[PDB]
């Protein structure tokens, strides 16, 4: 399919994105999650095209910054589809969201609460809880939850629901079913502290490649029909955009290393896209990217110690000037001048 | 030398540029201090030995009120050795906050240490 348009440009790192894969995956979504309303975590990929198709279908948008609600408000999306769900929210951001009609704002601590109280006190707060590996802890614990639920009243702020987020690398569905359980308990103490709760947000983390979805979604559906039967939204990201993109990188340096004891030829290729540019994954989530063509190790443009895309892979010789490919490079591979790059994306909508 | 103190913070100072020792007397938490340094708008927090004491981010989040509001910082950078052993989990967690990894050589930053930069809005 679009796995040729690459070649049509082969004659400086660039993307091609199957903009249909975005749609079929959304179709796959509401066929697997008919009850849940997906809200795109735009921080995953803030490319306008990716958003504009998604918005035009029927997905909400979990935004996390000023520029992000801009992108999504400019596309004429009604502020009733926007949820501001940044873990740590700056004050000016609370205000901007207030001045612009966005109402759903998350929280998981009293620190976040005070901030909301003096910037946007009339917001619809959704208490993010902590589903059971990361440094700091995110989400409230079942106890502190209650204290937040009371404090919200003792401040007179409307809490309208709860949220969680198991995130990536969840290696067991019994984690999802548990949060929804804890999400019930929290709904209670809220209804008990006197809140007309109605919004359950289950966050995001569902995979976007085939390396599974329905497996995670199928332990969910009986859990929602259980604890929450008769509103449910989500905050997916990696799901939608992963398998859509394919990165094309050009070899820009070649070196041969021998290591003789007393007999081992090995190649090193340097490309024009690195771990500080696109491949944030490998030092973030410790990815394992396999390279495609048309023994070695692939390194990045910055001559840095850990600008190492792949450390060891069996690969025929080159020379310089060749392109290599990486599939499923759509999630968290795009961002800018801090911090600069900007590549070019080729959207292919069949 | 009594820089700043409110209900949640206690930042004493160390000496030019201006180094800050911000400390969170949070509403119920243990003691969390962050040896930071403010140099020309931007502030540079150094990240402790790890693992992190149970208080942050509630502490660190306060460390972003101030300095956005008192130090009027446009940039807040964090740094840790590289090394360490949880560089991943570290890189990952702070990224959940509006942070991002900084490509070496930037004008606002040694090679033994890994940086990350959060910009305000
Ligand atoms: C609150 C929230 N929702 C959604 C996401 C992104 O979800 P996903 O893991 O599918 O990219 C993030 C970060 O993981 C997040 O912090």
Residue numbers in the entry:
A (entry chain A): 19 to 29, 38 to 158, 165 to 243, 247 to 265, 270 to 301, 310 to 341, 352 to 392, 396 to 410
B (entry chain B): 93 to 106, 111 to 205, 208 to 219
Published text:
Here, we describe the crystal structure of human ODC-cAZ1 complex in the presence of co-factor PLP. The crystal structure of ODC-cAZ1 complex was solved at a resolution of 3.2 Å. In the asymmetric unit of the crystal structure, the ODC-cAZ1 complex forms a heterodimer, which consists of one ODC monomer and one cAZ1 molecule. The ODC monomer consists of two domains: the N-terminal TIM-like β/α-barrel domain (residues 44–283), which binds the co-factor, and the C-terminal domain (residues 19–43, 284–410). cAZ1, comprising a sheet of eight mixed parallel and anti-parallel strands and two helices, is embedded in a concave surface formed between the two domains of ODC. The N- and C-domains of ODC interact with AZ1 to generate two interfaces, I and II, with buried solvent-accessible surfaces of ~2000 Å2 and ~1400 Å2 respectively. Overlay of our ODC-cAZ1 structure with the ODC homodimer structures shows AZ1 occupying the position of the C-terminal domain of the second ODC monomer. Therefore, the binding of AZ1 to ODC occludes the binding of a second molecule of ODC to form the active homodimer. As the binding of AZ1 occupies the position of the C-domain of ODC, it disrupts the substrate binding site, while leaving the co-factor binding site largely undisturbed. Our crystal structure provides additional support for this hypothesis by revealing the conformational changes of ODC upon AZ1 binding: the N-terminal domain of ODC moves by about 10° with respect to its C-terminal domain. This movement is accompanied by the transition of an ordered C-terminal helix (residues 411–421) to a disordered state, as the residues involved in stabilizing the helix have shifted by about 2.6 Å.
Ornithine decarboxylase (ODC) is an enzyme that catalyzes the first and rate-limiting step of polyamine biosynthesis in humans: the decarboxylation of ornithine to putrescine. ODC requires the co-factor pyridoxal 5′-phosphate (PLP) and is catalytically active only in the homodimer form12. Polyamine homeostasis is achieved by Antizymes, a class of small proteins that inhibit ODC activity and polyamine uptake into cells. In addition, AZ1 has been shown to inhibit ODC activity and promote ODC degradation by the 26S proteasome.
